[PDB]
Structure formats: C-alpha cells, structure tokens
C-alpha cells in the first residue's frame, strides 16, 4: 500500500513532467527560430559576421533541442526506473505458496 500510493504520486509527477515537456518541446516554437535562421541564411549577407554567428546560433538552438531531449531521457528513464523499483516492490514481493 505504501509503494502503491507512492506509485500514484509517481504517476501524478510523471503527468506533471509530461505536461512540462509537452509545453516546452512540443508547444514552444524553437522550430520557428530554426526557420528564421534558415530565412536569414536565405537572406544574402556578408558571411563574415552573419553566417558565422548564424551557424553559432544554429548550434545554440540545436543545443537547446538536445537539452530538451536530455530532459526527456533523464527524467523519463529516471521515473521509469523508479516505476521498475516499485514494480520489484510489487511484482517481486509476492506471497503465494504456504
């Protein structure tokens, strides 16, 4: 019962982090910034100051996207292994026989 209510807390916190990432990864418009840098590279420019820093800010937004993927990986694998800990509390603490 302790690990079950604890697991329900895990479920609610999982939904919380899921709403976090569905508003940050999915809902936020980093994709439009990527399109904006794509348009600015389509815009003709002195590539000394522009295209170098355009590429650096490409690296920055790709870094932000990788941070989003990192949040996905870290928190979801973490809570999934926490679910597995509760599963070994559940599926691997059983009484049947005597």
């Amino acid at each position: 019962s302790l690990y079950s209510q604890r697991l329900d807390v895990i479920v609610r916190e999982s939904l919380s982090s899921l709403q976090v990432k569905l508003e940050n990864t999915l809902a936020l418009t980093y994709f439009t910034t990527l399109e904006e840098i794509d348009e600015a590279l389509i815009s003709q420019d002195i590539d000394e100051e522009s295209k170098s820093e355009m590429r650096k800010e490409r690296i920055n937004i790709i870094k932000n996207l990788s941070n989003d993927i990192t949040q996905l990986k870290q928190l979801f694998i973490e809570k999934t292994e926490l679910l597995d800990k509760s599963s070994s509390d559940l599926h691997n603490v059983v009484i049947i026989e005597g």
């Binding site: 980093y30 910034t33 904006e36 840098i37 600015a40 800010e57 920055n60 937004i61």
Partner: peptide, 8 residues
C-alpha cells in the same frame, strides 16, 4: 536570434 529564442 538567441534573444529572439529567449524572448519566446
């Protein structure tokens, strides 16, 4: 555009 993205 870093601050455009940060603004967003």
């Amino acid at each position: 555009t870093s601050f455009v993205n940060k603004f967003q």
